[PDB]
Write a protein that binds this ligand. Structure first.
Ligand SMILES: [Mn+2]
Ligand SMILES: [Mn+2]
Ligand SMILES: [Mn+2]
Ligand SMILES: [Mn+2]
Ligand SMILES: [Mn+2]
Ligand SMILES: [Mn+2]
Ligand SMILES: [Mn+2]
Lengths: 545, 545, 151, 545, 50
């Protein structure tokens, strides 16, 4: 379909890089039982833990283990001893007294170009990981960030990473993915700085202890990286590039290259489904409303092998959120960042890429997203309007800026009529999540405890922090309207996420359902870029069902 | 000690009613298999479940449970009183129903004075409870509120309640307590309608099925009610009545009559303990700082049959919170309600009453509270000040309105030096709890999972909603200060409750600790009165150790 | 309301504040009724069954009692305030208290007794505001739509 | 009594000019039938109405005296000064019209120095008054303002004013008073520009038609001018000069020079009167609370000549209003002008001067004012405090910035115990009067229609615009408090003046009472000076009893 | 400090500073106060934050 243009210089497509430097990066995992690295390899990194514990005064680690006789720092010697002699017998002549004054708290890299055996320089490095076993996702993110800052030197076509820390396999996969995510840079909207060059790496050796338990995570890390990178590319695209038409075109193209059933619904067939709540939000835009419906049908490896789990994943999909007539005019409204209000849809599309590539068995996922804009014009819906959803319930629009829950209501009524076992919505719903869980944990609501436990157990493995939040039925009467069935906002309740989940719980009849509120954790405010949150979480949820 | 006065018309004491009308109320629990109530009775209430069908054609039913036929609205059945009241020519009317328009949704009572075998009017009633087994604490609160609106007719000196609903025993105890809490009104600061007459109830006969399993809850409900009512009486007292000295005197007088060891600390002995953070908050007040330290020592019934759990309970204890020089001037600051900022201290004192009355065995509880005011004056502490706590850490006061975590820091360092196993603080810390859990759930943070599980298991029994919230160690660097060890507020993180618990977690060294944030659930905004939240929770926590 | 200018349970105004504790001697709200039945038309008659009414404003007391034949009738009492201090605010509050009794489908026939002395314009206004509170707006509901025949 | 000082350079007195240039100004009124003025004169002014033309299409004459009238500026005539003049060098200089540019709309002066029988230039002038009979107080104020701008030339020791407009006698008196008020300048707080010089006028001839009906207003105009000027001098004095002690000293001095019974009440005797609401407001100040009670006892000219009316006039008297802990921090709070919050007290004191000078008969006025400050300190009262008034009612302070009604409550309970027939407050109570009547009309509330009619009939004569506003008993339940008898502010009613009058109506038992809200009409915002509003109104009220 | 250490020649510097706080109390100066400076000029304090 064709993107409408006001002027002829308007963009007509989302630029997407379908080929990253990671695609030609040859990765290999070998046991730390034999290194044979130092033969002139551009970079060599060492991930090292903090040695001591239970002290302070330069190595502060709280108290509780011994807390005694620190003397000049930590209670012991407080220096790290690097194993892994690096199989040269002349580079192991450097595992004597380098002594690594970096004291690797977290980050704190120290690059240095020693000579190998002839007059070339290898740029060996040391990166700090923290205490000896308190390695979580935050530590891994910080280590990957410190490690790419050493990788931004074009002199390195080969890299070797040595894991002298003890981490899990899911955390090793997360380290790989986040390293890739920090490494690649988005250059789609520059004028100079555009033509990407050879400078990227061509080899990556990872030396870890007992590597045969890890070398199955390589392909999964590549697929997960690209799913997250696709989602972040959609989110980072501005709204003159990422409109409902451009986004539905991108979804068609994705479903074409990962072999999913694409099915876009136009306003003609949405009027016959009575999707009035979703159409009222998109009334005041110049772009037509598009309803993406992808479908992955797993191969039935066995007739009665299992029960074929049918899952519906739904994303919010508001390519630009202005607030409507409840315009985002207040301070701290972040109206310049409201391009990220399609992060749920982008997570669902990235997960669509991941599942179309992995191709699990005995599963049927439906990737739904009601895409529209929330604009101010003369055709837009107004505060106080009464609209009708596709299940019959009328809704009073007490706030036009609470538009995500209306499109999600219509998408939920659509998903329930498919006949699924689980519905999982992901959305940047309420700006109140920034005051409840901040920027690191997404909150999950729901109406079924087994489904929420599945989502939490899949957040353990994907290393995307999710925290279970409550649906408090005491606030259900604050959504009562005098004239409609429900109001979309609360009169005199400020818990906005709980009220949004209470509203959405009214459009689910008899299906296990959960909702992931990613409003706070999808934009990295310090780096000014998207995280791609939710792709790995949804993929690990689907793959373990 | 003597309360300082500016004018001679200032109050010098918190007025407290140590004798409630509940003390004269004679309660009795009889099995529902023999009523004999109405003959020579005064008032009879019937708690009846509604009967919503498989679906509602107008009756607000919800989901399609086992069917969706929905005939005649929700005509699956009609409500009928399945117990006969042995007043023989009364129970005739009980078998006929006469349920004209009841439809017991929730609340929605129907008072009516049918005549007995005499020209006496008994004022029989029917109160709605909701669906058959969907009875939670919210339902019980609503039913108690509907039932005390029938009790405000002085014609009744003998009430009789019939439980046609099937509820737990903890929920039965909670129903009793909330009935008492709604019934008793606070009249200490009125001039007319001051002197209480003989209009209250003198008998309360409860009829429930299998009543011998319930009649152990009567004394526990009386004790819990008075603890909650004492706490609510402290919170509802204004700040010209409840100052640090008045509250100190009240704690002394309470420990005198529940036989606890009282120990109030003055500014002379607070300067020797280096409590600089607690002292800086109370600098700018006309009232001296008072540190309350009550102690309950249980009777050792077993030398080695058990282990003596030593617990420390801490409350915020800010009798008025103006914000300091970060004055509460913004809209929605609720400075008129800032008298409730000692809700944690009031909860600790109410639980002190409860445990001094129940007198558990093999337990030692320390009831701590650092009481002060956060006032603006010329001796006030200023934003940017650097203060030293009692463990030596220096704190930069980036915000004088985040004053509760400083007094709590000093109280926590004092509590760890007592040698306890569990520290539990309770505080109206962050106004962000209103945007996260609203007004019905209190969040609980902590550093130990077994302690948080004990607090949640005790929230189940006491029917005080608590939800576990995460302590996110990723925002810890937002408390890093350039000059002090810590800052008391975050730079560029808005999850204020998580940041507050991150701050407080730096003052606990090696002790299981949890923090219950009651900022959102202390005040009942619609009723304009305190809930007394926390007394029953802390009491049921201590009793089950 | 029977009494005036007292302060033990209500507010006075000092048009004579000579005691009157519990209104002291202001009396009860005995009604001049001619309800023809006997059982539920003698107490709500010359006799006294005004237990805790004290008709401030609103503060109704509905009760289904059997009137001398069978058939609980749901007699009620609604408070209007002082004897001649009846304005439009009082009338609105009384109409609001009276429609909350009318929202029980058991009643197809209603009788209202005016023991208060009001004007004719105020009587017309009472009727209009009663109707305005009684009739509810159901045009934009999905359920709750088809208005039942229980008016 | 002695004014407290923080530093030795603090002021210790209000500077008051007890002798104005008007005291030395000889005024005379002679009939216009024989002017003989310009014979050896210094300045002559002519007040001339706009000559009526038409439905002016050359200046927009306004409504339809005729449909279009076909006039367009030249409709019916032009202006001509047809009274007289003596010296025929200039007398026969204006007889031939000589206007040619005037069109005396409103103000629009034209001063000009023509020689006459010498080289002496006389500076005859012309001032515009408006249409021929639409002369109100606004026109008179504008004409007086245009006329003093001609008087600011020191060359004039004699002035003659010619009234060719037809006005009343009360309006003639108001013209005189407002001319005096514009003429004199407040020079008390300058460093240069201090030592007043001879430049002021020494004679003032007013030529009006039928002047014997007017020449009784001269003495009344002098007394009213000085009363208004005294009040405006008190209001214009800053708060480091006008504190409660300085103001009570000024009241003692006034009562000494007009022979009134002064009686100041200190905090010792206010504590025995139980004036807790008035003392709580003044707690947090460095200045003691002072209660002014002046008394004028008229000469009983006859035993049963009349009934001796006993009137109590009360003013607000808050020498500085900061808001307390509800600090005036919002935009448009006008905290730099809050020195005018004693305008009611100043009006009562100016009226005290007026009545002590006029000395009416058969009247007894009590001039009451509870003087205090509303400061922020550590001894101030807080939002939520419960205080007791001197009649027994407890009051919950929901807003410390609503402090005027508390001091007025205590003053009203004091005034009722004197045994008066009428109580009249005057106060700058609510900043909402600026949105209701603006800056020109004061609103009057009350509980008696005859008293309000008297106040309106006295606003007709004094030419101080007053408008009768309603006391709406429907908002009385928004002042209901859960714990006290009343709240001082309204929950969810924005009509602040009606709510303030409802609050004050609770402290009047059986007395006719009215309250004048001068919050909007006491400060002239465009001239940056006080109006002195209320002095003439209260004086004309008292004098017509 | 720098000039006491360098010790230049043929110069005379006066290092002046009027040190105080600007606090809220009951002894504070108020918006609208009229104060006199050391040369005689009177100043109206329209803003205590200036
Ligand atoms: Mn929005
Ligand atoms: Mn949005
Ligand atoms: Mn605070
Ligand atoms: Mn606080
Ligand atoms: Mn004020
Ligand atoms: Mn004021
Ligand atoms: Mn400043």
């Amino acid at each position: 379909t064709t993107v409408p243009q006001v002027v002829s210089l308007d963009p007509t497509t989302i630029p997407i890089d379908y080929h990253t430097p990671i695609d030609d990066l040859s990765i290999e995992v070998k046991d730390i039982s034999a290194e044979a690295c130092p033969a002139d390899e551009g970079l060599i990194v060492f991930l090292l833990n903090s040695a001591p514990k239970h002290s302070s005064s330069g190595g502060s680690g709280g108290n509780g283990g011994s807390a005694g006789s620190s003397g000049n720092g930590e209670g012991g010697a407080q220096i790290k001893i690097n194993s892994s002699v690096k199989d040269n017998t002349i580079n192991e002549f450097l595992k004597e007294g380098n002594m690594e004054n970096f004291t690797g708290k977290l980050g704190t890299s120290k690059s240095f170009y020693i000579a190998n055996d002839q007059k070339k320089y290898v740029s060996l490095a040391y990166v700090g990981c923290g205490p000896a076993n308190e390695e979580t996702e935050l530590e891994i993110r910080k280590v990957a960030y410190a490690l790419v800052t050493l990788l931004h030197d074009s002199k390195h076509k080969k890299v070797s990473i040595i894991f002298e820390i003890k981490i899990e396999e899911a955390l090793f996969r997360f380290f790989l993915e986040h390293l890739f995510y920090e490494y690649v840079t988005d250059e789609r909207f520059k004028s100079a700085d555009k033509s990407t060059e050879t400078d990227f790496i061509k080899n990556l050796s990872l030396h870890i202890a007992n590597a045969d338990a890890y070398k199955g995570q390589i392909d999964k890390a590549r697929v997960y990286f690209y799913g997250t990178y696709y989602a972040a590319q959609l989110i980072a695209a501005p709204s003159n590039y990422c409109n409902p038409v451009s986004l539905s075109n991108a979804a068609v193209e994705l479903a074409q290259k990962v072999n999913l059933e694409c099915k876009i619904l136009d306003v003609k067939e949405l009027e016959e489904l009575k999707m009035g709540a979703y159409l009222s939000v998109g009334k005041g835009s110049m772009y037509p409303n598009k309803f993406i419906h992808l479908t992955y049908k797993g191969a039935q490896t066995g007739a009665s092998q299992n029960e074929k789990k049918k899952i519906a994943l739904i994303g919010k999909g508001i390519t630009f959120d202005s607030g409507g007539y409840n315009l985002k005019a207040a301070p701290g409204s972040m109206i310049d960042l409201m391009k990220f209000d399609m992060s749920g849809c982008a997570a669902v599309l990235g997960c669509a890429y991941c599942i179309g590539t992995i191709k699990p068995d005995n599963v049927e996922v439906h990737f739904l997203s009601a895409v529209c804009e929330n604009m101010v014009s003369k055709n837009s819906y107004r505060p106080g309007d009464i609209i009708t959803a596709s299940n019959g319930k009328t809704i009073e629009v007490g706030n036009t800026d609470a538009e995500g829950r209306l499109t999600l209501a219509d998408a939920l009524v659509y998903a329930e009529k498919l006949g699924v076992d689980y519905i999982v919505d992901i959305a940047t719903l309420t700006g109140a999540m920034l005051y409840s869980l901040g920027t690191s944990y997404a909150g999950v609501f729901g109406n079924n405890d087994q489904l929420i436990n599945k989502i939490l157990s899949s957040s353990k493995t994907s290393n995307e922090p999710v925290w279970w939040l409550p649906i408090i039925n005491e606030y259900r009467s604050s959504l009562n309207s005098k004239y409609a069935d429900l109001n979309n906002i609360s009169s005199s309740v400020k818990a906005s996420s709980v009220v949004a989940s209470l509203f959405l719980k009214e459009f689910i009849e008899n299906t296990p359902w959960a909702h992931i509120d990613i409003a706070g954790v999808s934009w990295n405010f310090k780096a000014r870029k998207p995280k791609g949150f939710g792709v790995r979480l949804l993929t690990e949820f689907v793959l373990n069902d």
